[PDB]
């Protein structure tokens, strides 16, 4: 797999930050900053060669959207998916929650085209709407995917909050093959990981039997003395002191965590697709 350029990931975050500022300060469901975020991401994918779909739904009397991007080619009976919710709460720009995951997934999709990659399994990426309303967008996708298509899914990988300022490195403990793939990449960096325990878009896929996995750097919980010894940072302070706040801005990101988790995402996607 290729190394994902950290500066490219940060540049997508800067574009989302400007979008929030030009649309009343947020990127929330039912507000213009969310559809403006969808338009930015979709334009990059269309230019790279992806076949995109805008999936519309209604929640709370307002129109919502999920963006689906399919890379032409691959075995139609074995599909590998990766995703991230693209909405924020209405209090701020939601840069770590969840511009971080949205940006790592987009840059991985652009890296596939730049490398001229032809995976054995068909690749499909997704950016979810209305996750903050209770996983509304991802539930709409699973509820409307015919069972013949559900059986063709080899796995779903989720990235929701991967750039926390006082980070922990958590790996979901779900499907064994997916978990081992993420854990092995971190072992190669000599960075220890812990099981994710501290409610995201992988839930509706997991509940219908699709194998799932993912990465997380922590939210409102407090980092312990032992976690600070293995990862650095500040014991006694939250992993993210700006969770769901107006301060979840461009300054609310730890560059090392964003870089490692973006690189790990690309490693897992290459490994599990060929």
Which of residues 110, 112, 123, 161 is near ligand PHE by CB under 6 A?
161
The stretch near Ca ion (CB under 5 A) out of 106-114, 229-237, 250-258, 259-267 is 259-267
CB 160, min distance to Ca ion, A: 20
Query: Is 131 tagged catalytic?
Result: yes
- For residue 219, the partner it binds in Ca ion, ligand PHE, Zn ion, none, with Cβ less than 5 to 8 A by kind, is ligand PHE
- For residue 103, the partner it binds in Ca ion, Zn ion, ligand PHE, none, with Cβ less than 5 to 8 A by kind, is none
> Which regions of 46-128 does DSSP assign to beta strands (E)?
51-59, 62-70, 75-85, 121-128
Binding mask 65-104 for ligand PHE (x = CB under 6 A): --------------------------------x-------
Cα–Cα distances (Å) from 121 to 28, 72, 131, in that order, read 33, 11, 27
- Count of residues near ligand PHE by CB under 6 A: 9
Please check if 244 is assigned to a binding site.
yes
160 binds Zn ion (CB under 5 A): yes
User: Edge to edge, what strands does the sheet with 75-85 contain?
Assistant: 51-59, 62-70, 121-128, 75-85, 153-159, 212-216, 170-171, 194-195
199 binds ligand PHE (CB under 6 A): yes
219 binds ligand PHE (CB under 6 A): yes
Measured CA angle at 29 (ends 79, 172), to 5 deg = 45
Q: What's the CA gap between 120 and 126, in Å, rounded?
A: 19
Q: What's the CA gap between 240 and 255, in Å, rounded?
A: 14
> Judging by beta carbons within 10 Å of its beta carbon (0-12, 13-18, 19+), is residue 179 exposed, middle or buried?
buried
- For residue 263, the partner it binds in ligand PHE, Ca ion, Zn ion, none, with Cβ less than 5 to 8 A by kind, is Ca ion
Phi and psi (nearest 5°) for 57?
-150, 170
Please check if 68 is assigned to a binding site.
no
| CB-based contact 125:109 (threshold 8 Å) | yes
Q: Which is nearer to ligand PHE, 71 or 172 (CB)?
A: 172
Neighbours of 109 (CB within 10 A): 22
| CB-based contact 22:37 (threshold 8 Å) | no
Q: Which is nearer to ligand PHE, 23 or 102 (CB)?
A: 102
Q: At what angle do helices 100-115 and 6-22 cross, to 10 degrees?
A: 130
Q: Which is nearer to ligand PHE, 101 or 119 (CB)?
A: 101
CB 135, min distance to ligand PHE, A: 8
87 binds Zn ion (CB under 5 A): no
Q: Where do the H-state alpha helices sit in 145-192?
A: 147-150, 176-189
216 binds ligand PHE (CB under 6 A): yes
Please check if 85 is assigned to a binding site.
yes
Q: DSSP code of 177?
A: H
Binding residues (CB under 6 A) for ligand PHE: these are: 97, 131-132, 160-161, 199-200, 216, 219
Please give the annotated binding residues, written as ranges: 3-4, 85, 97, 132, 160, 244, 259, 263
Binding residues (CB under 5 A) for Zn ion: these are: 97-98, 160
């Amino acid at each position: 797999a290729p190394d994902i350029p950290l500066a490219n990931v940060k540049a997508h975050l800067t574009q989302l930050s400007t979008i929030a500022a030009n649309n009343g300060g947020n990127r929330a469901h039912g507000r213009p900053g969310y559809k403006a975020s969808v338009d930015y991401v979709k334009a990059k994918l269309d230019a790279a060669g992806y076949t995109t779909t805008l999936q519309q739904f209604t929640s709370g009397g307002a129109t919502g959207y999920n963006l689906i991007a399919n890379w032409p080619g691959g075995d139609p009976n074995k599909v590998l998916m990766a995703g991230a919710h693209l909405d924020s709460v209405s209090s701020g720009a939601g840069i770590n929650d969840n511009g971080s995951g949205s940006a790592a997934v987009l840059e991985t999709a652009l890296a596939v085209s730049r490398a001229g990659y032809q995976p054995d399994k068909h690749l499909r990426f997704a950016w979810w709407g209305a996750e903050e309303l209770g996983l509304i967008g991802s539930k709409f996708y699973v509820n409307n995917l015919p069972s013949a298509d559900r059986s063709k899914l080899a796995g779903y990988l989720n990235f929701d909050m991967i750039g926390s300022p006082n980070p922990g490195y958590f790996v979901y403990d779900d499907d064994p093959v997916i978990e081992k793939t993420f854990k092995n990449y971190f072992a190669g960096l000599n960075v220890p990981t812990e099981i994710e325990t501290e409610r995201s878009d992988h839930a509706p896929f997991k509940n219908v039997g699709v194998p799932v996995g993912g990465l997380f750097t922590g939210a409102g919980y407090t980092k312990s003395a032992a976690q600070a010894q293995k990862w650095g940072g500040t014991a006694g302070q939250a992993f993210d002191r700006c969770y769901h706040s107006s301060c979840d801005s461009l300054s609310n990101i730890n560059d090392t965590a964003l870089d490692r988790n973006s690189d790990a995402a690309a490693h897992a996607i290459w490994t599990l697709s060929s």
